[PDB]
Amino acid sequence: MNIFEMLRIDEGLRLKIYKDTEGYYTIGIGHLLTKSPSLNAAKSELDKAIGRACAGAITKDEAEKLFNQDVDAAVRGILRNAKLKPVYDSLDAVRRCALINMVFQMGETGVAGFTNSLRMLQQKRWDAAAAALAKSRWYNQTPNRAKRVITTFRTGTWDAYK
């Protein structure tokens, strides 16, 4: 299993503009277009991201290209972040993927906000980290996905995804 396969499971794949769990316009494999209520605005962001007139739809290849860009951006955002980097550096390969998953979903700043959980991960207190992560809007809004990531952090294996 790898980060791509993992996020592909959590986010799905849709070739036509859709609303994510918070009602924002997204497309592809979890690629947020805009927070704005306007379908037009969405459509304009899409055209601008792809570089052509998509009329609200993209191809598979296009979806994948955006996904490669988003994953890379998330890894680089972690490595540049003073709060995240040291965590990431302290973790084993499976758990690094769990950290990347959260950044992809909520962004760096959001993740950097889980101060206590970050500190526990770093100290390798897995069960305490799991509990801290669970006490969040994140967990209450998207529980099944949250659980899958938290379990990965707890165990360091891919069972939650197999």
Binding residues for Cl ion, per CB under 5 A?
114, 116-117, 132, 135, 142, 144-145
Q: What angle do CA 153, 160, 119 make, to 5 degrees?
A: 10
Among 10, 20, 47, 64, which one carries the catalytic annotation?
20
Residue 11 annotated in active site = yes
Residue 20 annotated in active site = yes
Q: How far is the CB of 69 from Cl ion (least distance, A)?
A: 24
Residue 44 or 122 having the CB closest to Cl ion = 122
Q: How far is the CB of 6 from Cl ion (least distance, A)?
A: 14
130-147 CB burial, b ≥16 within 10 A, e <16: bebbeeeebeeebeebbb
Q: How far is the CB of 13 from Cl ion (least distance, A)?
A: 16
Q: 76 exposed, middle or buried (CB, 10 Å; 0-12, 13-18, 19+)?
A: exposed
Catalytically active residues, by annotation: 11, 20
